[PDB]
Enzyme design. Structure first.
Site, PDB file in Angstrom:
ATOM      1  N   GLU A  35     -38.147 -52.895 -35.596  1.00 26.19           N
ATOM      2  CA  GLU A  35     -36.718 -53.306 -35.628  1.00 26.19           C
ATOM      3  C   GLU A  35     -36.103 -53.205 -34.240  1.00 26.19           C
ATOM      4  O   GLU A  35     -35.328 -54.047 -33.883  1.00 26.19           O
ATOM      5  CB  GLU A  35     -35.971 -52.405 -36.570  1.00 26.19           C
ATOM      6  CG  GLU A  35     -36.222 -52.612 -38.028  1.00 26.19           C
ATOM      7  CD  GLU A  35     -35.703 -53.943 -38.551  1.00 26.19           C
ATOM      8  OE1 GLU A  35     -34.981 -54.693 -37.820  1.00 26.19           O
ATOM      9  OE2 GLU A  35     -36.129 -54.386 -39.670  1.00 26.19           O
ATOM     10  N   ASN A  46     -26.563 -61.748 -35.932  1.00 23.07           N
ATOM     11  CA  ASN A  46     -27.069 -62.571 -37.031  1.00 23.07           C
ATOM     12  C   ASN A  46     -26.271 -63.854 -37.128  1.00 23.07           C
ATOM     13  O   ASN A  46     -25.140 -63.932 -36.704  1.00 23.07           O
ATOM     14  CB  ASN A  46     -26.962 -61.772 -38.347  1.00 23.07           C
ATOM     15  CG  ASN A  46     -27.633 -60.404 -38.305  1.00 23.07           C
ATOM     16  OD1 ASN A  46     -27.078 -59.327 -38.690  1.00 23.07           O
ATOM     17  ND2 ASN A  46     -28.820 -60.442 -37.916  1.00 23.07           N
ATOM     18  N   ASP A  48     -24.758 -65.194 -39.619  1.00 26.27           N
ATOM     19  CA  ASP A  48     -23.515 -65.057 -40.426  1.00 26.27           C
ATOM     20  C   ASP A  48     -22.380 -64.408 -39.642  1.00 26.27           C
ATOM     21  O   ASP A  48     -21.291 -64.252 -40.198  1.00 26.27           O
ATOM     22  CB  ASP A  48     -23.764 -64.381 -41.787  1.00 26.27           C
ATOM     23  CG  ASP A  48     -24.157 -62.902 -41.681  1.00 26.27           C
ATOM     24  OD1 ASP A  48     -24.254 -62.377 -40.531  1.00 26.27           O
ATOM     25  OD2 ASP A  48     -24.422 -62.247 -42.755  1.00 26.27           O
ATOM     26  N   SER A  50     -22.549 -61.246 -38.508  1.00 28.81           N
ATOM     27  CA  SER A  50     -22.744 -59.789 -38.581  1.00 28.81           C
ATOM     28  C   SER A  50     -23.668 -59.451 -37.397  1.00 28.81           C
ATOM     29  O   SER A  50     -24.239 -60.317 -36.752  1.00 28.81           O
ATOM     30  CB  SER A  50     -23.371 -59.339 -39.885  1.00 28.81           C
ATOM     31  OG  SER A  50     -24.674 -59.894 -40.036  1.00 28.81           O
ATOM     32  N   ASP A  52     -26.650 -56.329 -36.168  1.00 29.36           N
ATOM     33  CA  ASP A  52     -27.521 -55.191 -36.467  1.00 29.36           C
ATOM     34  C   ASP A  52     -27.486 -54.206 -35.298  1.00 29.36           C
ATOM     35  O   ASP A  52     -27.536 -54.577 -34.147  1.00 29.36           O
ATOM     36  CB  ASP A  52     -28.977 -55.651 -36.664  1.00 29.36           C
ATOM     37  CG  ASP A  52     -29.142 -56.519 -37.871  1.00 29.36           C
ATOM     38  OD1 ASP A  52     -28.355 -56.619 -38.764  1.00 29.36           O
ATOM     39  OD2 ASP A  52     -30.226 -57.127 -37.959  1.00 29.36           O
ATOM     40  N   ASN A  59     -27.011 -53.271 -40.507  1.00 26.74           N
ATOM     41  CA  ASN A  59     -26.150 -54.464 -40.455  1.00 26.74           C
ATOM     42  C   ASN A  59     -24.702 -54.236 -40.807  1.00 26.74           C
ATOM     43  O   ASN A  59     -24.358 -53.501 -41.752  1.00 26.74           O
ATOM     44  CB  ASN A  59     -26.768 -55.534 -41.336  1.00 26.74           C
ATOM     45  CG  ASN A  59     -26.040 -56.841 -41.253  1.00 26.74           C
ATOM     46  OD1 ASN A  59     -25.171 -57.065 -42.016  1.00 26.74           O
ATOM     47  ND2 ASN A  59     -26.371 -57.638 -40.314  1.00 26.74           N
TER      48      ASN A  59
END
Ligand SMILES: [Cl-]
Ligand SMILES: [Cl-]
Ligand SMILES: [Cl-]
Ligand SMILES: [Cl-]
Ligand SMILES: [Cl-]
Ligand SMILES: [Cl-]
Ligand code: NA
Length: 129
Positions: A35, A46, A48, A50, A52, A59
């Site tokens: 990750e 991301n 959308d 959002s 991380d 998120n």
């Protein structure tokens, strides 16, 4: 902070991730590797809108507040920035919430695609724990 493999395993163990919801410590170290490359400061946007955050790429759509993800929740009741600290306490506590939600470690795309079903004990091999 960029952790070493065994340094992170120890930190995770001390904060109670080893076998948390049945996931052995190697699973958590492996997820962190893929990750974030073991970097507490990692961030990724991301599609959308959002983002991380941190060593486990938690998120802002659901889990933390970053002030720029409209309509989102903050189920861990933390600013996302808390997830970037060299102290992994906030990340680990929020990870425990996520893995408890129903989908287990499938919440972590890198876990599902690069750790699940693999020899995850390799990630804690050689470590003093
Ligand atoms: Cl190390
Ligand atoms: Cl490594
Ligand atoms: Cl393991
Ligand atoms: Cl906040
Ligand atoms: Cl720590
Ligand atoms: Cl599970
Ligand atoms: Na949020």
């Amino acid at each position: 902070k960029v952790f070493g493999r065994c340094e992170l395993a120890a930190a995770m163990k001390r904060h109670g991730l080893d076998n948390y919801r049945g996931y052995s410590l190697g699973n958590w170290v492996c997820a962190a590797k893929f990750e974030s490359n073991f970097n507490t400061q990692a961030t990724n946007r991301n599609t959308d809108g959002s983002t991380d955050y941190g060593i486990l790429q938690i998120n802002s759509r659901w889990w933390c507040n970053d002030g720029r993800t409209p309509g989102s929740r903050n189920l861990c009741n933390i600013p996302c920035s808390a997830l970037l600290s060299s102290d992994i306490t906030a990340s680990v506590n929020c990870a425990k919430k996520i893995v408890s939600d129903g989908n287990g470690m499938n919440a972590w795309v890198a876990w599902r695609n690069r750790c699940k079903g693999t020899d995850v004990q390799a990630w804690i091999r050689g470590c003093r724990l």
